[PDB]
Amino acid sequence: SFNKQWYLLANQIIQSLSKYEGGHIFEKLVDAKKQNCPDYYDVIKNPMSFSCVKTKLKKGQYGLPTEFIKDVQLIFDNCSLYNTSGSLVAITGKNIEAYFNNQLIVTGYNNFVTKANTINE
Ligand SMILES: Cc1cc(C(N)=O)cc(C)c1-c1[nH]c(C)c2c1CCCCC2=O
Ligand SMILES: [Cl-]
């Protein structure tokens, strides 16, 4: 069915991000002490990781395909907010964001978004 099909696609896409070069930095939430960033959660108020998205997909927490996109984009927006533009972490986020947005085209995922936008118009 409709929702099962884009859930399957979303799981495929999130897994490709996890395997992308340097994608491990987005897998788990930042540990303020262990990653030497004591101020992280003072700056980042809506934290998000690949593993959070996988949990929402596993549990059935998304109702619309755009909710998946919003959460993944939030990871990259957190990245560019906290990290300085030239840094290894900021580079990695820009790389994976670019990859992610291309995958939404290549997999047809955006077409589920287009179909769902007309439904809830
Ligand atoms: C670089 C890094 C390495 C590992 C690891 N297990 O090696 C784990 C994490 C969570 C991270 C990481 N990821 C992000 C999105 C961030 C960090 C910490 C540095 C700056 C703050 C920051 O934004
Ligand atoms: Cl690393």
Side-chain angles (χ1 to χ4, degrees), residues 1-32 35-69 71-114 116-120:
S1 70
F2 179 79
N3 291 322
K4 294 178 188 254
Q5 281 316 113
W6 61 258
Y7 260 73
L8 288 179
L9 248 196
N11 271 307
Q12 176 186 315
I13 293 172
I14 201 64
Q15 197 59 271
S16 79
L17 305 189
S18 295
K19 304 171 173 270
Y20 201 81
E21 179 168 71
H24 62 279
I25 74 172
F26 298 120
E27 191 63 32
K28 305 304 190 190
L29 294 156
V30 170
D31 183 315
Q35 264 78 61
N36 299 310
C37 39
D39 66 338
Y40 185 78
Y41 292 107
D42 294 324
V43 176
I44 292 317
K45 304 268 80 138
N46 300 289
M48 189 66 60
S49 67
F50 294 164
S51 69
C52 305
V53 175
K54 295 174 175 181
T55 289
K56 291 180 149 187
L57 288 163
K58 173 190 189 190
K59 301 284 193 188
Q61 297 190 43
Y62 292 131
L64 295 177
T66 48
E67 293 163 23
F68 169 73
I69 295 169
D71 282 354
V72 174
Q73 186 60 39
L74 171 58
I75 304 175
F76 307 135
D77 291 338
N78 289 347
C79 186
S80 60
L81 170 56
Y82 186 82
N83 297 279
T84 299
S85 177
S87 63
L88 295 193
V89 170
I91 290 171
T92 299
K94 285 307 203 247
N95 287 340
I96 297 189
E97 171 186 61
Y99 178 78
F100 172 67
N101 286 328
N102 191 67
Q103 288 308 120
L104 294 172
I105 303 169
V106 174
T107 56
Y109 190 89
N110 281 341
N111 293 336
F112 292 90
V113 167
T114 312
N117 290 334
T118 308
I119 303 329
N120 320 278

